[PDB]
């Protein structure tokens, strides 16, 4: 019938039919399994909880993310999420609707090939396509030229595009993302004292980071202000009922993006990687890429991130070049929106990977989707 | 005059002057208060017994550890312990000798600040220093590169160091330690029947664990052998006079370290944490850290723990990398020996925290001493 877009992220699965303006079902990409004893009060249970159900009763489960840094590690778990989405969230038969996938750039070819084989054999998808997340974000933005910074839960890549001609040599991929920020918040919440170790407590830390954390315009000045007994101290309520206070940890958790040396990573910050990616293109392209900086992904939703990175780029970039950053309010679902736009295009209907092509070329056929 | 090192552990306080090869006074970190009535029979009495005196007559006291899990919670009890040490064990005036303290890594800044303020105000130490226990253990070992697994009574951390450059991002901290093992032995001694509920009976269970418990090379094989009516059954004589028999509980109490799921802990075993800490370092550091696995702490004195840890890590580690575990006979006082070595160094004499620095910077001055 109609195509469905399933953007399987590294911590948040977003799926829905093509042509819609928002994903139909958004649930965490979590598979939870029982941890405690073999059940006393037992009448009707399951051996594994997938998605929102796992997080609902996470107190007795060991949540495990199948996808780490945009790379699928547990294939049985990923199959579980795919089946759960197709048969409980969209509630449609996968054998009738073509499926469009998203994959981070500079990813192993084995991962994409195995994903293609799994969804094309376990399910009976008539036609499957795999596209880069940054290209989909640019499609959602509505323009054809610009540089996309898709900072998701597991990966932070940067694909510059000019007039629809993507440059596959200035693409810079960073492994710093929401999961690393959550881990850093777990590590540095020990300072005041409140420490979280279990996976459910990791989800609690992720919620704390989502709700309270923000990006400081000036790190040193904000740190001095916080140390000077200022009002930068918010209170969060744990599920057990205890209130915790977050001081300078608010702007130190997402400062790792601009300073990866916090967790001992040699790579430069997101602003420096973006500037390097811009400077790796032709001299006639940098002017247009500077004024069309596009953000996407969940972790780009921190308050003040756009101003901070604009200031950093303006410091790095020449003063005579105008620096503009595009931060739409729908940054969380920008990749899915772009996928929905692309899948409904009349020209894109010929770019699918039909069943006959897969049968005649085996499962090493997804290598001309290169963007 | 001469500096003194006071390694206040979470269950055993070791103190002594710098330059010595062994602590001068080792007594339990226990503060006990009378539980029963004052009673007519009184010729001289104290409202609280500290240290070995509390354990000597522990039949009429409710012993309370000031430190557990590496944090002091009762600061009055800690003040009492420090005063008892300085004025009865070392028998020296604290105002004349600088004091060096040890603190577990990944600990609240508030706790260390409070300890600094207490020792600089209640006592008048001319200088003071707070150091990480694993760094002191590496100092005692005499080498500059290696990974230290310091498993004390309340904490079990793991700090990897290469050429004296500690990596403060691969440090893994675990809360499985001697107190948790003692509690587990108390819980599973119910199986045979001999159960101990009070704090003095908890000390008895701790003595049983110290004297009889050991780590099995193969847990399943040892369990089958014990269930097959083997000779793994040793007899312990309680102070009341009744002998008890310990069967498979000998190697099940310290198996919690390699299987935290026994007491419902989501974290992984000490071998897995060590492997993860090694794998979190640079690829050029892993080879040297594999062959320099330094072990310290009291609970690493179980018979056969070194062989079991080496076997588990070799199973985890690649087969082409040589694995060597260093377990010196002085593992119990390794931290204190390293502290004594460091405090007597000519270079370390400039890194103290003088009273003038504390006065000009307040209690919140110990934050440049991070290791």
């Amino acid at each position: 019938t109609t195509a469905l877009v399933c953007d399987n992220g590294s911590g948040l699965v977003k799926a829905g039919f093509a042509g819609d303006d928002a994903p139909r079902a958004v649930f965490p990409s979590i598979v939870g399994r029982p941890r405690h004893q073999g059940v006393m009060v037992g009448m009707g249970q399951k051996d594994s909880y997938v998605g929102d159900e796992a997080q609902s009763k996470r107190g007795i489960l060991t949540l495990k993310y199948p996808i780490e840094h945009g790379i699928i590690t547990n294939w049985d778990d990923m199959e579980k999420i795919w089946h759960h989405t197709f048969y409980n969230e969209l509630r449609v038969a996968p054998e009738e609707h073509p499926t469009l996938l998203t994959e981070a750039p500079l990813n192993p070819k084995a991962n994409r090939e195995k994903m293609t084989q799994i969804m094309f054999e376990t399910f009976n998808v008539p036609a499957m396509y795999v596209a880069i997340q940054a290209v989909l974000s640019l499609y959602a933005s509505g323009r054809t030229t610009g540089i996309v910074l898709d900072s998701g839960d597991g990966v932070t890549h940067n694909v510059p595009i000019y007039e629809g001609y993507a440059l596959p040599h200035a693409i810079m991929r960073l492994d710093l993302a929401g999961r690393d920020l959550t881990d850093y918040l777990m590590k540095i919440l020990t300072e005041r004292g409140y420490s979280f170790v279990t996976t459910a407590e990791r989800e609690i830390v992720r919620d704390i980071k989502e709700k309270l954390c923000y990006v400081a315009l000036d790190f040193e000045n904000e740190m001095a202000t916080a140390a000077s007994s200022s009002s930068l101290e918010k209170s969060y309520e744990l599920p057990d009922g205890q209130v915790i206070t977050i001081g300078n940890e608010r702007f130190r958790c997402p400062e790792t993006l601009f300073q990866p040396s916090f967790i001992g990573m040699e790579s430069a910050g997101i602003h420096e990687t973006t500037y390097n990616s811009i400077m790796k293109c032709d001299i006639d392209i940098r002017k247009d890429l500077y004024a069309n900086n596009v953000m996407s992904g969940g972790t780009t939703m921190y308050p003040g991130i756009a101003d901070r990175m604009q200031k950093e780029i303006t410091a790095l970039a020449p003063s005579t070049m105008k620096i503009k950053i595009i931060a739409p309010p729908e940054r969380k679902y920008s990749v899915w929106i772009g996928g929905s736009i692309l899948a409904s295009l009349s020209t894109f209907q010929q770019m699918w990977i039909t069943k006959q092509e897969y049968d005649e070329a085996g499962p090493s056929i997804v290598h001309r989707k290169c963007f | 005059t001469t500096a003194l090192v006071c390694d206040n552990g979470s269950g055993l306080v070791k103190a002594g002057f710098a330059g010595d090869d062994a602590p001068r006074a080792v007594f339990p970190s226990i503060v006990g208060r009378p539980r029963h009535q004052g009673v007519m029979v009184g010729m001289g009495q104290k409202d609280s017994y500290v240290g070995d005196e509390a354990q000597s007559k522990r039949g009429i006291l409710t012993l309370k550890y000031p430190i557990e899990h590496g944090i002091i919670t009762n600061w009055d009890d800690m003040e009492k312990i420090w005063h008892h040490t300085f004025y009865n064990e070392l028998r020296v005036a604290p105002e004349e000798h600088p004091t060096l303290l040890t603190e577990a890594p990944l600990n609240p800044k508030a706790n260390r600040e409070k300890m600094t303020q207490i020792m600089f105000e209640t006592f008048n130490v001319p200088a003071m220093y707070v150091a990480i226990q694993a760094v002191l253990s590496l100092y005692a070992s005499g080498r500059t590169t290696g990974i230290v697994l310091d498993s004390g009574d309340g904490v079990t951390h793991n700090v990897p160091i290469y050429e004296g450059y500690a990596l403060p991002h691969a440090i893994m901290r675990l809360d499985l330690a001697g107190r948790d093992l003692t509690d587990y032995l108390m819980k599973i001694l119910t199986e045979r029947g001999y159960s101990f509920v009070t704090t003095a009976e908890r000390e008895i269970v701790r003595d049983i664990k110290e004297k009889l418990c050991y780590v099995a090379l193969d847990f399943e094989n040892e369990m089958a052998t014990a269930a097959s009516s083997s000779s793994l059954e040793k007899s312990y004589e309680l102070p009341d006079g009744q002998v008890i028999t310990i069967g498979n509980e000998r190697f099940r109490c310290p198996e919690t370290l390699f299987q935290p799921s026994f007491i419902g802990m989501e974290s992984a075993g000490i071998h897995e944490t060590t492997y993860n800490s090694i794998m979190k370092c640079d690829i050029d550091i892993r080879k040297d850290l594999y062959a320099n696995n330094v072990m310290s702490g009291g609970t690493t004195m179980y018979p056969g723990i070194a062989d079991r840890m080496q076997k588990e890590i070799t199973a985890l580690a690649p087969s082409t990398m040589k694995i060597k575990i260093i377990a010196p006979p002085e593992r119990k006082y390794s931290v204190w020996i390293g502290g004594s070595i460091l405090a007597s160094l000519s270079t370390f004499q400039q890194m103290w925290i003088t009273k003038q620095e504390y006065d000009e910077a307040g209690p919140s001055i110990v934050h440049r001493k991070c290791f």
Binding site: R192, G193, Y194, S195, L238, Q242, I244 | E68
Partner: peptide
């Protein structure tokens, strides 16, 4: 501790 674990 204050949040998580006792200490």
């Amino acid at each position: 501790w204050x949040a998580x674990c006792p200490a």
